[PDB]
Design a protein around this ligand. Structure first.
Ligand code: 7RC
Ligand code: 7RC
Ligand code: NAG
Lengths: 325, 89, 379, 50, 49, 50
């Protein structure tokens, strides 16, 4: 197209033509009608539950407050009972603790009518507390997906991928404008990317889906178009706000042509009216673009229940230390 | 909230017939190509002090479930009188 | 009069041996008016194209009888040959497009009036004349409802086998540690009873170094049980059937794929509407290779897990879905239109027919007809 | 399992009476059910005349 | 509007004009662009039993 | 306000009619005008207007 316009065989070129420092000294470009640049596409993630989620339902004030309240209730019950092994201060605490946690462990009942009312009230409080805790935990189990995005060609994941978990293995199609720009801007990244060269764009999506690749660097417009029509919406771009070497698609016109001003004015008028949004709604928008993160609650694994096991181990260590003393 | 609408860009304004339009545009294009604009963006507009994500469900606070404690306190206050009367009779 | 076969509006049944419709009565205890309409068999004529008479009845027949009584004129009802409504198409001969079906029969003069569920559109409004709509309706989509089954695996689903094995190891570890700290089967029994909440055993860890361990074990068991219950509840709540089309603007309909199949009746108003659209080229192209030759055939195909969605008139789909208990109309009505009586231009019946239709609408005769032949919602 | 299923079943939505309209027992025979159905219109108009 | 059309002071009447058996002997109506009639409006019910 | 009201479906409507355009008793314009309206029902502009 550039040769045809320069050779006078045509007056204007309409298509996906990029604007750059070069190619402008021989042809005049109009106002771009669509943004583009160098973006990165990565596969979507889901996420799991936090290890400490088992403490989410109740705030710390609650747990300590209930501890102090249980201690006070046990002391009051012991005092009331004071008025062979009839009862003891150390056994009331054990009985109350057993009652709170579903009343599973064996306990010794008191030998006083007055203490029975206190035991019943404590049991009612414990059942209410257990029901509330279970309901809150069930509510907390609704977890949505999270987009593990990156700043884009400016974070440690791309500059120094060898100083962390296995490298991101980001790759791009060689022998193109993007490769030249990467080489001219970041020599180290270009050198490191030589081990993940992709032949074509169609196979890049398959490689990313399988797991052989974790990030594909390419033109923003093409990546957005491909992501829009994904068969499962498992691929998401980085975002329009973080794009490297931003540019736009324009219309090539003859040098010193009188139609350039009118063409730019018409394009600006189209932008102002709102026709561009309508056109992009049916020509660029894919199957799934205005979608949130699916919940798709999963099961529990060792990592999910790490907090409970850690607490059990800490309790065992404390018991051993107390026994040693 | 929402998606960007009315996409546009920031530019340098000048009076018509000013001998700086072509040079200014070329300088802007060169800055975009050589990564100067990226450095400027990373220097001034680049901050993640407090990010955001799907907020977790609300947690029950003291004021949200302050009824059970009051009920148990009332039970104990009644029980003290009950035991006093039982001992007195 | 030329009529077509539509179940809600035109019931067609075989005659008796003597050549008369079997006597029938409605629920209220009144005879159902019937007329003898001469038409071909249910299937295509083909070789046995004999036009055996088959008397028909229905709401349209009652409307025709009322119109004939209002204005003195005799009728002779018969069915259409090709069994289609009407459309404009070319022929293998010279390029002279001509109408087919009821529209073609009316234009060619074989019929003087049309009494059937014929939609009013601009395409066929330039050649014939329509009266006032005797029934306002729209376009809807019919699908098959899925049984609400639960896709739950064994009880081990919430916890992976690794977690189960770790819990089993942990219970034994706590039991053995408690037994050693005492100075046994009693510790194991106590641990199992605490974990499973069975109330078996009388273990009494009097040692001050074992009460803390027992309390921690009880708390751990309670936490595990609560987590399992919460996970099961969350999984059960989030287990719902896939959403339906819910309108024509569903992205699934916008992008046609072999996974989902939808079509309509060939050579009908729906086909014209879909072909005329500029933004629905993909849908029309996809449906061009799946259209059916009749509404009943499409309904049967959709019923027997063969067709995923059927686009048709709301007035018919609603009646069909109100007596099947397994079909549901999804989405909002689009392309609102009405049913009218078609006639040839410059006929001395248009004004009188329209006035009679308006009078019937105002008085309440139409309503009755809808109650008698429609409004059978039982699902 | 019973508790989880019961919690799942506790979710409920809204429903519409789905009246046929001027042809059901609600409007024809209000006295069969609670007679005071309390349904009216605006007088001195086409609807009232009809 | 009907009187104005009848009195020859206007050719068409555009608005919320209803079609009926009467009023049709003096003017000619076109294909309706919107449908209406007699309808019933009711509030909503929770229905959670 | 609050979306607490509702109306029965369009199918359950008594004495159905429509809104039209009044024209002169004898005039050819109607013959075209009707067609124009039908055209609006084909391109789908009626749905957007509603
Ligand atoms: O300006 C152009 O000619 C086209 C070509 N672009 C492909 C760029 C290929 P690479 O980045 O160099 O590997 C897509 C749209 N613009
Ligand atoms: O008749 C008309 O020309 C107008 C007047 N309509 C008001 C009807 C009021 P009511 O039901 O008779 O009390 C609204 C649109 N049509
Ligand atoms: C614009 O740049 C050209 C070289 O490209 C230079 O000769 C000219 O002086 C510049 N204009 C101004 C106003 O400095």
């Amino acid at each position: 197209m550039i040769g045809e316009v320069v050779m006078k065989r045509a007056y204007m070129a309409v298509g996906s033509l990029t604007i750059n420092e070069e190619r402008s000294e021989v042809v005049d470009f109009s106002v771009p009608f669509i943004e583009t640049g160098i973006s990165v596409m990565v596969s979507r993630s889901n996420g799991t539950v936090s290890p400490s989620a088992f403490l989410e339902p109740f705030s710390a004030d609650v747990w300590v407050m209930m501890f102090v309240m249980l201690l006070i209730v046990s002391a009051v019950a012991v005092f009331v009972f004071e008025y062979g092994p009839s009862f003891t201060i150390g056994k009331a605490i054990w009985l109350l603790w057993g009652l709170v946690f579903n009343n599973s462990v064996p306990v010794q009942n008191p030998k006083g009518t007055t203490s029975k009312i206190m035991v019943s009230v404590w049991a009612f409080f414990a059942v209410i507390f257990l029901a509330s805790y279970t309901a809150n935990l069930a509510a907390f189990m609704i977890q949505e997906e999270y987009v593990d995005q990156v700043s884009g060609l400016s974070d440690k994941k791309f500059q120094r991928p060898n100083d962390f978990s296995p490298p991101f293995r980001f790759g791009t199609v060689p022998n193109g404008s993007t490769e030249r720009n990467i080489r001219n801007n970041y020599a180290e990244m270009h050198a490191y990317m030589g081990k993940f060269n992709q032949r074509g764009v169609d196979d890049a999506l398959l490689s990313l889906k399988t797991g052989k690749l974790d990030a594909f660097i390419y033109d923003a417009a093409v990546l957005n178009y491909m992501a829009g029509r994904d068969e499962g919406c498992k691929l998401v771009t980085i975002g329009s706000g973080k794009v490297f070497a931003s540019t736009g698609y324009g219309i090539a016109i003859q040098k010193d042509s009188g139609w350039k001003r009118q063409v730019d004015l018409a394009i600006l008028q189209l932008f102002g009216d709102g026709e561009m949004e309508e056109l992009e709604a049916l020509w660029l928008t894919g199957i799934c673009h205005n979608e949130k993160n699916e919940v798709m609650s999963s099961q529990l694994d060792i990592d999910n229940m790490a907090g409970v096991f850690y607490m059990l181990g800490a309790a065992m260590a404390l018991s051993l230390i107390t026994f040693i003393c | 909230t929402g998606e960007l609408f009315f996409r546009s860009g920031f530019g340098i304004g000048m009076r018509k017939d000013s001998p700086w339009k072509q040079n200014v545009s070329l300088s802007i294009l060169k800055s975009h190509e050589n990564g100067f604009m990226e450095d400027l963006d990373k220097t001034w507009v680049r901050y993640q002090e407090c990010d955001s994500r799907s907020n977790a469900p609300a947690t029950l606070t003291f004021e949200n479930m302050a009824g059970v404690f009051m009920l148990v306190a009332g039970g104990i206050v009644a029980g003290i009188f009950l035991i006093f009367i039982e001992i007195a009779y | 009069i030329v009529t077509i076969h539509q179940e809600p509006f035109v019931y067609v049944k075989p005659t008796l041996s003597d050549g008369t419709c079997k006597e029938e009565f409605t629920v209220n205890g009144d005879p159902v008016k019937k007329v003898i309409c001469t038409g071909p068999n249910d299937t295509s004529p083909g070789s046995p194209r004999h036009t055996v008479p088959q008397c028909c009845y229905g709401f349209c027949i009652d409307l025709l009888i009322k119109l004939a009584r209002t204005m003195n004129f005799t009728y002779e009802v018969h069915l259409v040959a090709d069994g289609k409504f009407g459309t404009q198409e070319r022929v293998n001969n010279s390029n002279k497009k001509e109408w087919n079906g009821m529209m073609g029969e009316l234009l060619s003069g074989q019929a003087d009036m049309i009494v059937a569920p014929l939609t009013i559109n601009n395409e066929r409004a330039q050649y014939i004349e329509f009266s006032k709509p005797f029934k306002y309706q729209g376009l809807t989509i019919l699908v098959k409802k899925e049984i609400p089954r639960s896709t739950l695996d064994s009880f081990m689903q919430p916890f992976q086998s690794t977690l189960w094995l770790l819990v089993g190891l942990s219970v034994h570890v706590v039991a053995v540690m408690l037994y050693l700290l005492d100075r046994l089967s009693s510790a194991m029994w106590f641990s199992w009873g605490v974990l499973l909440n069975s109330g078996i055993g009388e273990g009494a860890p009097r040692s001050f170094s074992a009460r803390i361990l027992g309390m921690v074990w009880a708390g751990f068991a309670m936490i595990i049980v609560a987590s399992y219950t919460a996970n099961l509840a969350a999984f059960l709540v989030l287990d719902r059937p896939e959403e339906r089309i819910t309108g024509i603007n569903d992205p699934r309909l916008r992008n046609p794929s072999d996974k989902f199949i939808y079509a309509t009746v060939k050579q009908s108003s729906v086909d014209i509407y879909f072909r005329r659209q500029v933004e629905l080229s993909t849908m029309y192209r996809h449906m061009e290779k799946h259209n059916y030759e009749s509404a009943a055939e499409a309904i049967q195909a959709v019923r027997d897990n063969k067709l995923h969605a059927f686009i048709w008139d709301s007035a018919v789909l609603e009646f069909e879905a109100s007596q099947k208990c397994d079909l549901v109309t999804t989405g909002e009505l689009f392309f609102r239109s009405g049913f009218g009586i078609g006639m040839r231009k410059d006929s001395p019946w248009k004004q009188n027919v329209s006035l009679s239709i308006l009078k019937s609408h105002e008085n309440g005769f139409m309503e009755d007809l809808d109650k008698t032949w429609v409004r059978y919602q039982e699902c």
